[PDB]
Amino acid sequence: MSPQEVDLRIGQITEKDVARVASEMIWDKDIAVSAVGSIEGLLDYNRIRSSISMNRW
Amino acid sequence: GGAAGGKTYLGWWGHLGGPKQKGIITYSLSPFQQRPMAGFFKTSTQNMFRRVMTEGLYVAIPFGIAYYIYCWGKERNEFLNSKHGRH
Numbered sequence: 001m002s003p004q005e006v007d008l009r010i011g012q013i014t015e016k017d018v019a020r021v022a023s024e025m026i027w028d029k030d031i032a033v034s035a036v037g038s039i040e041g042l043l044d045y046n047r048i049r050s051s052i053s054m055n056r057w
Numbered sequence: 058g059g060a061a062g063g064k065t066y067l068g069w070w071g072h073l074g075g076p077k078q079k080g081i082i083t084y085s086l087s088p089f090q091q092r093p094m095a096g097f098f099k100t101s102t103q104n105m106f107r108r109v110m111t112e113g114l115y116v117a118i119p120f121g122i123a124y125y126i127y128c129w130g131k132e133r134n135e136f137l138n139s140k141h142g143r144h
């Protein structure tokens with residue numbers, strides 16, 4: 001892709017597209033984790049997942 | 058805060074006061090990917106059968122003896138205060 005095409009594609013981005021993508025991909029969706037080292041303080045899966053969707057709204 | 062608390066055996070997250078572990082890999086799935094009510098009946102039936110066949114007499118013997126002496130005591134006490142019992 002030419003730099004003109006990249007600039008045009010980036011320019012189209014607005015805040016509502018970001019909101020839509022974050023709502024359809026990140027908001028309350030399954031995650032895959034992987035930990036190595038001293039992970040005694042890392043809580044279990046359900047408590048980790050519960051933080052990916054805020055409850056105030 | 059501080060206050061220099063005492064000595065316990067629980068601690069908290071991060072420092073639980075346990076021996077150092079090494080080379081213990083652990084895998085688990087997501088609750089939304091696994092299926093509840095999968096293999097529940099079979100495993101539960103096998104576990105109940107094994108528990109009944111294993112513990113079993115441990116409870117069976119004392120309760121049976123107690124019930125037998127209960128029945129015998131009731132029968133004898135009813136008989137003795139009747140007409141023929143006192144004679």
Ligand SMILES: CCCCCCCCCCCCCCCC(=O)OC[C@H](COP(=O)(O)OCCN)OC(=O)CCCCCCCCCCCCCCC
Pocket residue numbers: 046047049050
């Ligand atoms: C005292 C009680 C008497 C009244 C009983 C009726 C109460 C009605 C409750 C309705 C069912 C609960 C729905 C919430 C489901 C949910 O949202 O679960 C979510 C949360 C956390 O999970 P998560 O966000 O990490 O999931 C992550 C998803 N990705 O789980 C809970 O907080 C469990 C709360 C259940 C209610 C508390 C019961 C224990 C109180 C009694 C024991 C202590 C007694 C103290 C003396 C009184």
